[PDB]
């Protein structure tokens, strides 16, 4: 790699990993559209298995970029509309509240406040029903944004309910496959197992625990390499071939509204380039921007993950770590790395 991505790689990680005591970390820069990889420690301490390119880590939070691209596609199908009411795809969802909330709010926290997590006791298909029929908003849709994996997490499963696939059958068809992440699962497979990393929690190795709408809100597992990919997809959608995966991640980007200098699109969240909060409506939304600096934080108890890129600069950055750290960390290194070679 080219010795100025090489330093500032370097210089920026190897403090970093050592003040946050992570055990192991993939590194991904996107320098003028080519992929440049770097790794250090472990992937299980016990048994001293490096990091590699092809180690797993759980992406946690990042995973709702998928989700939210799937859900683009799924709408330049014309399957679904974020317009569209979401009783209109669960007519269960009788509950008066309901009303007037749309599959965009779901998709962007704005319902009216979604709670953070599903409750551990939600299990089955009618548990969830009870859940949403029983949830009181404190506030009118569209009004207040509060991020919520109960809120995108339904818009997954509702988004792919025309297309009659299941969640993961979805992802893998529509964007998976087309887009060769052919190391990246909602569930890893026997065969992945050697290369899925150990995340560690005050020194025990843990993995992601089942949960309800797990799939559609933290539950991707990726390596660095197809994670590099997923950010050359975002940076360039229109390279990519299939017609609908296209639409897909643009308008996975565009800005739906607006909280101080951050914008909500699909999964993505964007501020130009170079927690209950009030929302402004963008009306109508603006496309995806190349002048923007588009991100996702991502964590599960083990993992702490970070994506972020700049299209008009063909420039990204992915860290995955085997270990949930302050995001205000994974920010400094990543907009020391990318201003650098800005």
Same mark, same amino acid.
């Given at each position: 790699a080219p010795q100025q991505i090489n330093d500032?790689?370097?210089?920026?990680?190897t403090p970093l990993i050592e003040q946050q005591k992570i055990p192991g970390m993939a590194v991904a820069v996107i320098y003028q559209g080519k992929p440049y990889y770097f790794t250090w420690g472990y992937a299980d301490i016990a048994k001293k298995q490096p990091v590699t390119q092809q180690t797993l880590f759980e992406l946690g939070?990042?995973?709702?970029?998928?989700?939210?691209?799937?859900?683009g596609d799924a709408i330049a199908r014309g399957e679904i509309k974020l317009s569209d009411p979401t009783t209109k795809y669960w007519p269960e969802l009788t509950a008066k509240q309901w009303n007037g909330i749309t599959l965009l709010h779901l998709a962007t926290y704005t319902a009216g406040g979604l709670p953070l997590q599903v409750p551990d006791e939600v299990k089955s298909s009618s548990d969830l029903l009870?859940?949403?029929?029983?949830?009181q908003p404190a506030w009118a849709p569209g009004t207040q944004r509060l991020y919520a994996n109960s809120s995108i997490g339904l818009f997954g499963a509702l988004a792919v309910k025309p297309s009659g696939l299941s969640f993961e059958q979805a992802m893998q068809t529509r964007v998976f496959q087309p887009l060769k992440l052919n190391h990246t699962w909602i569930n890893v /497979?026997? $065969?992945?197992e050697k290369n899925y990393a150990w995340g560690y929690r005050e020194g025990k190795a843990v993995h992601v625990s089942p949960g309800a709408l797990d799939a559609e809100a933290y539950g991707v597992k990726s390596t660095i390499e197809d994670m590099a990919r997923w950010v050359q997809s975002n940076l360039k959608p229109?390279?990519?071939?299939?017609?609908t995966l296209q639409q897909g991640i643009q308008l996975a980007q565009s800005r739906?509204?607006?909280t101080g200098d951050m914008y909500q699109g699909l999964g993505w969240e964007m501020l130009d380039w /170079?927690? $209950?909060?009030?929302?402004?409506?963008?009306t109508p939304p603006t496309p995806?921007?190349?002048?923007?600096?588009?991100h996702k934080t991502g964590a599960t108890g083990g993992f702490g993950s970070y994506v972020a890129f700049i299209p008009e600069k063909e420039l990204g950055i992915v860290m995955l770590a085997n270990k949930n750290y302050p995001n205000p960390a994974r920010v400094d290194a990543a907009w020391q790395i990318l201003n650098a070679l800005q």
């Open positions: 500032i790689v370097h210089r920026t990680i939070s990042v995973s709702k970029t998928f989700t939210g691209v799937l859900g009870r859940f949403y029929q029983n949830w /497979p026997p $065969a992945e229109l390279d990519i071939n299939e017609k739906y509204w607006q /170079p927690a $209950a909060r009030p929302v402004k409506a963008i995806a921007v190349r002048a923007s600096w588009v």
